[PDB]
Design a protein around this nucleic acid. Structure first.
Ligand SMILES: [Mg+2]
Lengths: 613, 1316
DNA sequence: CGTCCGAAGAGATTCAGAG
DNA sequence: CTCTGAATCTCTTCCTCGTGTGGTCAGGACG
RNA sequence: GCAGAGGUUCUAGCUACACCCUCUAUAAAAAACUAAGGACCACACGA
């Protein structure tokens, strides 16, 4: 009864079943803002029954609590209005069942809806790692004023835009809105309403909605760009910038401070993430939240307008694919004949077959990619012009909305070698793509890897849960007790090198970390950075300008505080743009940040200088 | 030729490849196994009689009295399937066994018995399988899934790697009996053979050989080849054969007859071996050092005194050589040892072995098996002979013996069940050879090694357990009791064996609870093969290699259909064509292949058998003369795909669909979609819920008809004939004269089951599929069961689907559904929930069933009757009282909150001896009248059929037609006929008719007695009231919607019909799906399915237009003929000219809603064929139509993909999931939620949630969840009072769970205290 | 009516080569 | 001859929340 | 309203989480009203 999962500790002390908890499936509800979530009427009624009883007694409608319960059972009209009052400003916690990381549970300001399903705002669903497939989230209701205020200040979604694991925002557009933004931020060499000048974003939107001018067409527009260079002030810059109608429409959405360079590009998923990060760093949290909600609305609307449908004809089989397969067949036949004559051993024969099949796979992949993006041709008022593809599959892959290049290869190009359960590569790869008919033996070889991957996912989540538990338990004995440790010693930080291009630049590693010692400019005996200053975005960019190589950095290990970790030694919390607040639990944050990717983690001479220097 | 239902609607069939074998009866596995199990077998193998013959000696110890089995019969079940289901009693056939007891006169076993005693004893109540293949155990259907367990035999596991941490391989051999004690032999890292039995401590493997009474010298002879040394004056010249020289370097120069062949320190050449053989000299000079390394093979004793010069298996030394020379023995025997291959493993393990005699070995074995007990010589001998040499305690099955011999490569197939000494020594030799290098370790994952244990074998094993326990009891009783005192009935007790069988059937890991929501689910669950179960791998102990699909699973179990979750791959379903061998190994039908012709005859091949042969690809083109048009065809010979020549091929796949199961095959375009998505889709299909009306799948595999026919839900006509009468309750067929029996055939009557609850709370309703006067052929679908349309399994309703993002309402997997879907009730699914209120005998008086309840509204009481039970057919909502029950001094059953439905029927069961209430009496009398009327109508229908058969015969014999009319209808015997065979037939029919009148009155009386007698109830209850709620579940936001291809998503919003996008034709799309899902999860088939459904609906629309306007039958005829032709050649080649032009109109009437299309699983329609199908209709060949926004009205750029797709509503509805609760009843740990349950309670805030709050700067809310919300009684009460007061204040207190922990630690004797 | 009969690794615990 | 480093033998879990189904010491008669 | 009982209803209602009035040894002019207790193991399924 004491030890084990069934033991009283883990069952009833560490994690306790709680009251005021509601569970239901998830729904998108795009109309909701970021802090608001849909909540069924009956679910809010059941969850908020004590508050409803108290408000009923205060109103005088029911003299006794028993009368209030009878009123609730009758479900009369006055009960609904009372439920509206309590729900209006009382945050509730939305919590996905596997709470891998800190963002697993986030508060929301409930909005009463007619239905039986909870609606979660689309942007945060990526942060919740929640799909819309019978996924269910527990809904807990804070009771005390301390609790409601606590949820509003911390647990609420708008309060934590940045994931604790890394400074990159976690509410980044994921599937539909990113696709719509990519569709808006694209250029077609010939389209309706091309080559005309536009007064501003308002005129661009008016032209598109009227339909006389196409959504994506290169047009010179006037934009009022605002700069944050002025200290706590915005300065307007007016210029004629060549762009598409879609980009000009998108510009009115973004806040003033952000420059036009970010929206001028195609705005892939990484581009939108960088846009949100820059908005957070420059404009602040509230403009970032408003911009995120507005960008989600615009992405949804213009994706619906786009109608980026997936179709069989959308995928294209390479014309060179059959010839490549024939050439590979000739090569494998020659290697087989060499094996028969005994010129090549069985092992080297198998290795050569695998290598040439992989080379043919890469060739057919390149041919498929060229048939996707390069093959698209439409005139530029002249004879012929070549442009980037508007094919739906290539839009989905390139924008980063869904899938990757490898999956596009699997759909249209040759699938490639599929491994046997032992891990050894099968000699004969799956020639047919997923679009064409697939052979029975080919399907068997594929399902080998599929079942292997499913079992790997099961063991991955099991071991990831165990690792997260161990990480938390070695963690949680660390809080920020002391504001400043005042220790000179710290770890040296240099860009990581494995012999190739640097995996991580020095700036990203040193970002958010307080220097252990005052670093020096390349000019000798110059104090480029003071000893104890925190490294913000502008400061780090300045460090990139001077191109420093090694920066001594305060580390939690170097911190000598007893039973605690210095705030300056820890550095930026990464939850929000400042030095970590005193007292916050670094240990559990870090343990969850490490444990969370565990599911994504898989279960299983001479020296040449890259560049002159 | 086409059956009439096939004529009513014929699926257009793609796929050029013909099938040589029709799909077998899907439920043939379970039905055939149980049929073998119960069938009387004079041969007495693999049956109940086999178990009886195996265990009935019943020989009294020295009492000279024994009971011998003679025969066993299964009496007819007391209750029918419907009656036992409604009553809750198991559907069981009473087992009465005739047993004969004979008493030998004392002191003379050879003397004949003094007397013979004959009697029939009813022992055990055994469940009987229904025709559908499901046992009814407690009024709920149960089918025991077949168990995939490692077959008995000897197996060799490499165990490479992790053992010894040095990369060495540790070979082990396991002899696994079917029932008994495992025998395992293991190689140590030191290479000593150790034996471990039943996971005991490792013991030297030689010890058993001592227990085998084999002498040490005989052991060394068995496991080594003796090398002879002759005492010679020329320094002990030794007889050497060149064969032993191979594989070893020459430690010494080898010279014979003055010629040295291999020099000192020179590797021995095979040429040197051949030269020495050519010389052929037995004796070769050897030095003293070589014999020193050798080991003496057998004991040598001095002749003078008898003392042993050299101990057996003792290392030689120079002084030992001097002593043996002193002995002067001419023959000296030495073991052969080859370091490269022939290791002397027996020698070292013998040195390790501490026992030199049989008795000491037996003592050590007894100590290992029974530590803590003093060893006894006789006891140890009995223990060993019982462990391995006794049939009763150790048994190897016939399949086990065959696998054992095949692994040991012995010639004989069948042998003795008992393990024998020769078997053990052969196993050790095989293991030693494996260690040497000869042979290879077999794979446990190889499906040839893993047999399928069907329900029959498991029932036989449990019955044998009951029989052996009963046998021990009867042996104890018979010796004690005096002979001839009592008839041999009381000695046999039915209770132990009956309890064992009932325990196995009701409560077992393999006795899964039936999932009856879909006919596909019903067939899949019966066909399901599970590695879990008794005598099988558990989920945790299951290794990774077991879960992964081995290449031999091809055509035997479906690699696609495996349940995802804790048990992945362990529960893989049986493939469609697979059939179990008599030994239990899986067999796949394979076409015999002549060198140039694919011969039509099919030979079933086991997993081990297919390894020897080469099997052709299913997707291999045939010239129709049997020749492959391709000179080189891909094949699977050794489990790996490889090109092969035409002549090399020895076997060909029976069909393209043999690899996938019944569930997986139903997914169209299975070759096009990803394996993971196919797995998920096949899982989702079993979870679909039947709709109010079944709708045919416009795009289908073509196996839907087979699934519907083979499933038990569909009522199929036993004998073909015309339907004189069709009704919703019942269907009556007038049997054809040819197909009807010559006598007593009558006319067939079928009673369709109306709306009844399932094990998954889904309605089962057979709706008649034929009309009055419609001929029905043999083996034809009569009425459509759940999720069935025209004999085609129709799980869900297909509808127009458009792939496009719609303002994010279909974000990543979400699904948008039009208001039109709700309006026409396409996904409205009838859900039947049964609520039971039981009157329990209690202290202070029994609880009453009266209508009057203290402190209730009169309006609620109005719905109930006078007796206190809700009126049948009444409408009730959440919170209402269904039946009024008062606690002794309130306990009235109430509708669960949220549930709203109408009561289909109320059944009340009352114990014998307690008076039935007024409503119960009314229900009983109504049941009596209903059963009597149904029975009498059946009798008069049979009378009508009997007269009709007789009426046709009265024409012969001179009987006038008018004279017949005056004579009474009931009896026609009075009219005389000329004597003939027909006259005798009429006389026999008349006598049988009188006997049937008597049988009819007797059966009516018996049914009355069955209804009249009060139903048996659990002790402590007076009567049980069962009320069934029928709830119609409208499709609702949050419901789970899943296609067949695996795209699963919830319905985000019920968009209005006007808001929905519409094409230029003006039809709004019913469902809007997210295209972005398609590239990420490569279920590209759903897009191809969408295009094919679009083509089908286009053809259907053209046919409907041709039907809306009055059109010539010839025009529709030629149009449908063109549609069925469709360019590329197809197997069907259906001809419209055969149709009578009246069947054409009905076929078009069926086709107008949609055109069924049959797509083979792996030979399905190609893209070119789909394009041609679109071109045949008016619809674009591109498959994408310009679509106009419902709200804005502007047509979308980049025209979207719109087409009809099959979509299944999953039973995972939102209303069942929704569980919000403020406060609920607590547990004994006082944790208020009391577990997440359908009964009100709260969700768990587990460890990871607490970590999440801790990572946040959140502490107060965590403190609430820990104390004031969950387990602080004072805290909870004060919090509730404060909240209702409006002031939200918190008092921490201490969690009651913490005090529980403190008290539990105190109970351990550890002082834990709270410092002040 | 009351009343007595695989698997992975860590740690302890043998274990054993070598002066 | 007494420990050395090694090989063997023994604890200790091995995700995390739902929703439905079923099965669970059993004293037994006697003063 | 804090220890009990009575009252107009309906056996009993003294705050039991609980609904009205009276007083410290005595029972009625009076309408809205009433109930606080219960586990594990297996199977299947969703994530
Ligand atoms: Mg999900």
């Amino acid at each position: 009864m004491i030890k084990g999962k069934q033991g009283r500790f883990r069952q009833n002390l560490l994690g306790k079943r709680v009251d005021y908890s509601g569970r239901s499936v998830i729904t998108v509800g795009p109309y909701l803002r970021l802090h608001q979530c849909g909540l069924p009427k009956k679910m809010a009624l059941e969850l908020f029954k004590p508050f409803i009883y108290g408000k009923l007694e205060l109103r005088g409608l029911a003299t006794t609590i028993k009368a209030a319960k009878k009123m609730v059972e009758r479900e009369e009209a006055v009960v609904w209005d009372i439920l509206d009052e309590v729900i209006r400003e009382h945050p509730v916690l939305l919590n996905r069942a596997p709470t891998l990381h800190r963002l697993g549970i986030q508060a929301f300001e409930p909005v009463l809806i007619e239905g039986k399903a909870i609606q979660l705002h689309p942007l945060v669903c990526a942060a919740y790692n929640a799909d819309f497939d019978g996924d269910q989230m527990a809904v807990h209701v804070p009771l005390t004023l301390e609790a409601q205020l606590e949820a509003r200040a911390l647990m609420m979604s708008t309060n934590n835009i940045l994931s604790p694991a890394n400074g990159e925002p976690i509410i980044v557009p994921s599937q539909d809105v990113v696709l719509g933004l990519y569709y808006m931020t694209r250029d077609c060499v010939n389209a309706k309403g091309e080559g005309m000048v536009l007064t501003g974003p308002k005129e661009a939107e008016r032209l598109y909605r009227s339909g006389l001018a196409s959504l994506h067409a290169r047009v010179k527009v006037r934009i009022t760009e605002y700069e944050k260079d002025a200290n706590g002030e915005l300065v307007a810059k007016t210029s004629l910038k060549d762009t598409t109608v879609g980009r000009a429409i998108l510009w009115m959405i973004v806040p003033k401070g952000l420059p036009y360079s970010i929206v001028n590009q195609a705005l892939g998923k990484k581009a939108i993430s960088k846009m949100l990060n820059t908005c957070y760093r420059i404009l602040g949290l509230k403009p970032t939240v408003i911009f995120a909600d507005q960008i989600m609305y615009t992405g949804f609307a213009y994706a619906a307008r786009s109608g980026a449908s997936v179709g069989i004809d959308d995928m294209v089989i390479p014309e060179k694919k059959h010839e490549i397969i024939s050439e590979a067949e000739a090569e494998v036949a020659e290697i087989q004949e060499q094996f028969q004559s005994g010129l090549v051993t069985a092992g080297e024969r198998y290795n050569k077959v695998i290598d040439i099949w992989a080379a043919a796979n890469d060739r057919v992949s390149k041919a498929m990619m060229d048939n996707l993006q390069t093959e698209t041709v439409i005139n530029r008022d002249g004879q012929e012009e070549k442009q980037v593809s508007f094919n739906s599959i290539y839009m989905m892959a390139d924008s980063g909305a869904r899938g990757s290049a490898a999956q596009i290869r699997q759909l249209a190009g040759m699938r490639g070698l599929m491994a046997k359960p032992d891990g050894s590569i099968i000699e004969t790869p799956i020639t047919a793509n997923f679009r064409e008919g697939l052979n029975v033996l080919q399907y068997f070889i594929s399902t080998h890897g599929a079942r292997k991957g499913l079992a790997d996912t099961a063991l991955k989540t099991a071991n990831s849960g165990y690792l997260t538990r161990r990480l938390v338990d070695v963690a949680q004995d660390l809080v920020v007790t002391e504001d400043d440790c005042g220790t000179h010693e710290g770890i040296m930080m240099t860009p990581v090198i494995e012999g190739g291009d640097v995996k991580e630049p020095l700036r990203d590693r040193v970002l958010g970390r307080v220097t252990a010692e005052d670093v020096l400019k390349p000019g000798t005996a110059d104090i480029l950075v003071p000893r104890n200053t925190l490294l913000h975005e502008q400061w780090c960019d300045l460090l990139e300008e001077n191109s420093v190589d090694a920066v001594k950095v305060r580390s939690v290990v170097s911190c000598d505080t007893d039973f605690g970790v210095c705030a300056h030694c820890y550095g930026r919390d990464l939850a929000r743009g400042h030095i970590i607040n005193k007292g916050e639990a670094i240990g559990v944050i870090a343990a969850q940040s490490i444990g969370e990717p565990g599911t994504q983690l898989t279960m299983r001479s001479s020296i040449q200088v890259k560049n002159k220097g | 030729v086409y059956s009439y239902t096939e004529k009513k609607r014929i699926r257009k069939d793609f796929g050029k490849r013909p099938q040589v074998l029709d799909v077998p009866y899907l439920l043939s596995i379970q039905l055939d196994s149980f049929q073998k199990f119960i069938e009387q077998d004079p041969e007495g193998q693999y049956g109940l009689e086999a178990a009886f013959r195996s265990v009935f000696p019943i020989q009294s110890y020295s009492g000279n009295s024994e009971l011998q089995y003679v025969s066993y019969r299964l009496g007819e079940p007391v209750f029918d399937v419907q009656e036992c289901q409604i009553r809750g009693v198991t559907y069981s056939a009473p087992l009465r066994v005739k047993l004969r007891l004979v008493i030998y006169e004392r002191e003379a076993p050879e003397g004949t018995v003094k007397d013979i005693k004959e009697q029939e004893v009813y022992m055990g109540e055994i469940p009987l399988m229904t025709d559908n293949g499901t046992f009814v155990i407690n009024g709920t259907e149960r089918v025991i899934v077949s168990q995939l367990h490692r077959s008995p035999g000897v197996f060799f596991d490499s165990d490479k790697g992790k053992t010894h941490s040095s990369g060495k391989v540790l070979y082990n051999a396991r002899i696994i009996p079917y029932r008994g004690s495992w025998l395992d032999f293991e190689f140590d890292p030191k290479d000593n053979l150790f034996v471990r039995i039943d996971r005991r401590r490792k013991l030297p493997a030689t010890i058993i050989l001592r227990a085998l009474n084999y002498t040490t010298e005989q052991i060394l002879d068995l496991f080594f080849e003796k090398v002879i040394f002759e005492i010679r004056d020329n320094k002990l010249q030794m007889e050497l054969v060149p064969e032993r020289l191979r594989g070893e370097t020459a430690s010494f120069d080898i010279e014979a007859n003055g010629k040295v062949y291999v020099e000192k320190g020179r590797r021995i050449t095979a040429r040197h071996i051949r030269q020495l053989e050519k010389d052929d000299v037995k004796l070769i000079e050897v030095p003293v050092e070589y014999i020193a390394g050798k080991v003496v093979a057998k004991d040598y004793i001095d002749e003078s005194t008898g003392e042993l010069i050299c101990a057996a298996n003792m290392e030689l030394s120079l002084d030992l050589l001097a002593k043996l020379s002193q002995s002067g023995h001419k023959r000296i025997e030495t073991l052969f040892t080859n370091d490269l291959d022939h290791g002397p493993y027996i020698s070292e393990t013998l040195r390790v072995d501490p026992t030199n005699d049989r008795l000491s070995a037996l003592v050590e074995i007894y100590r290992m098996m029974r530590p803590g007990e003093p060893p006894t010589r006789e006891a140890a001998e009995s223990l060993f002979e019982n462990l391995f040499f006794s049939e009763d305690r150790y048994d190897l099955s016939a399949v086990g013996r065959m696998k054992f011999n095949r692994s040991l490569l012995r010639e004989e197939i069948e042998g003795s069940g008992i393990l024998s000494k020769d078997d053990i020594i052969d196993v050790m030799k095989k293991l030693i050879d494996i260690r040497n290098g000869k042979g290879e370790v077999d794979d446990i994952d190889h499906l040839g090694n893993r047999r399928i244990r069907s329900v029959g074998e498991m029932a036989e094993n449990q019955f044998r357990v009951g029989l052996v326990r009963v046998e021990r009891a009867v042996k104890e009783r018979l010796s004690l009791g005096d002979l001839d005192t009592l008839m041999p009935q009381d000695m046999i007790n039915a209770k132990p064996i009956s309890a064992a069988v009932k325990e196995f059937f009701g409560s077992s890991q393999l006795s899964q609870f039936m999932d009856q929501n879909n006919p596909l689910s019903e067939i899949t669950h019966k066909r399901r093969i599970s590695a879990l179960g008794p005598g099988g791998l558990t989920r945790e102990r299951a290794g990774f290699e077991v879960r992964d699909v081995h290449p031999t699973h091809y055509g035997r179990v479906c690699p696609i259909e495996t349940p995802e979750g804790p048990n992945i791959g362990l529960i893989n379903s049986l493939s469609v064509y697979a059939q179990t061998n008599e030994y239990g190994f899986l067999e796949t039908p394979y076409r015999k292949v002549t060198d140039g012709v694919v011969t039509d005859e099919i030979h079933y091949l086991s997993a081990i058998e297919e390894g020897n042969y080469v099997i052709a690809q299913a997707n291999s083109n045939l010239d129709e003369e049997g020749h492959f048009v391709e000179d080189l065809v891909t094949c699977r010979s050794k489990g790996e795909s490889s090109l092969f020549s035409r002549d090399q091929v020895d076997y060909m796949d029976v069909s393209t669909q043999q690899v996938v199961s019944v569930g997986a095959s139903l997914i169209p375009f299975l070759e096009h979609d990803d394996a993971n998505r196919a797995l998920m889709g096949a899982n989702m299909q079993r979870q679909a819920v039947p709709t109010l009306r079944a709708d045919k799948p416009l795009v289908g595999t073509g196996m839907e008809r087979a699934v519907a026919v083979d499933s038990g839900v569909t009522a199929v006509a036993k004998r073909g004939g015309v339907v004189q009468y069709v009704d919703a309750s019942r269907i009556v067929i007038k049997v054809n004269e040819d197909e009807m029996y010559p006598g007593e055939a009558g006319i067939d009557i079928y009673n369709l089951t109306k709306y009844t609850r399932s094990n998954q709370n889904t309605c089962i309703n057979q709706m008649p599929c034929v009309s009055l006067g419609e001929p029905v052929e043999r083996g034809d679908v009569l009425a459509d069961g759940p999720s069935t349309d025209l004999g085609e399994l129709a799980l869900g309703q297909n509808m127009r689907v458009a792939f496009m993002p719609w303002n994010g309402y279909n974000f990543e997997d979400s699904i948008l559904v039009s208001e039109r879907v709700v309006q026409e009730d396409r996904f409205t699914t009838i859900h039947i929930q049964e609520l039971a209120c039981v009157s329990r005998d209690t202290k202070l008086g029994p609880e009453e069933i009266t209508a009057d309840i203290p402190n209730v509204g009169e309006a609620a009481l109005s719905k109930l009757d006078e007796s206190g039970i809700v009126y049948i057919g009444a409408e009730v909502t959440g919170g209402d009282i269904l039946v009024g029950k008062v606690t002794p001094k309130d306990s009235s059953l109430r509708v669960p909150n949220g549930v709203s439905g109408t009561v289909i029927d109320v059944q009340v069961f009352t114990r014998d001896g307690v008076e039935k209430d007024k409503r119960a009496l009314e229900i009983e009398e109504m049941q009596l009248k209903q059963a009597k009327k149904d029975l009498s109508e059946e009798l008069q229908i049979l009378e009508a059929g009997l007269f009709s058969r007789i009426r046709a015969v009265l024409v012969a014999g001179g009987v006038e037609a008018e004279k017949l009319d005056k004579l009474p209808r009931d009896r026609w015997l009075e009219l005389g006929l000329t004597d003939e065979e027909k006259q005798n037939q009429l006389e026999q029919l008349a006598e049988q008719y009188d006997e049937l009148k008597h049988e009819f009155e007797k059966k009516l009386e018996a049914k009355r007695r069955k209804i009249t007698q009060g139903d048996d109830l659990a002790p402590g209850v007076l009567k049980i009231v069962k009320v069934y709620l029928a709830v119609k579940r409208r499709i609702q936001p949050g419901d789970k919607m899943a296609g067949r291809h695996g795209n699963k998503g919830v319905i985000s919003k019920i968009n209005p019909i006007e808001d929905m996008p519409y094409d230029e034709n003006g039809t709004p799309v019913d469902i809007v799906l997210n295209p972005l899902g398609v590239p990420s999860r490569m279920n590209i088939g759903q897009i191809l399915e969408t295009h094919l459904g679009m083509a089908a609906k286009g053809i259907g629309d053209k046919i409907n237009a041709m039907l809306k306007q009055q059109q010539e039958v010839a025009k529709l005829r030629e149009f449908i003929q063109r549609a069925y032709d469709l360019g590329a050649d197809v197997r069907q080649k259906v001809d419209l000219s055969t149709f009578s032009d009246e069947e054409v109109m009905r076929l078009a009437e069926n086709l107008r809603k949609g055109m069924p299309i049959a797509t083979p699983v792996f030979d399905g329609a190609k893209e070119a064929e789909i394009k041609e199908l679109l071109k045949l209709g008016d619809l674009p060949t591109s498959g994408q139509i310009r679509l106009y926004d419902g709200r804005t009205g502007e047509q979308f750029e980049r025209p979207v993909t719109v087409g009809y797709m099959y979509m299944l509503k999953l039973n995972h509805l939102v209303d069942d999931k929704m569980h919000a609760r403020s406060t609920g009843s607590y547990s004994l740990v006082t944790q208020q939620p009391l577990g997440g349950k359908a009964q009100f309670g709260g969700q768990r805030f587990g460890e990871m949630e607490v970590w999440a709050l801790e990572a946040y700067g959140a502490a107060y809310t965590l403190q609430e969840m820990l104390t004031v919300k969950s387990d602080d009684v004072n805290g909870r009460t004060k919090m509730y009072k404060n909240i209702v007061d409006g002031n939200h204040q918190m008092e921490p207190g201490m969690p009651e769970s913490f005090n529980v922990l403190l008290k539990e630690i105190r109970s351990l004797g550890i002082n834990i205290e709270l410092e002040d």
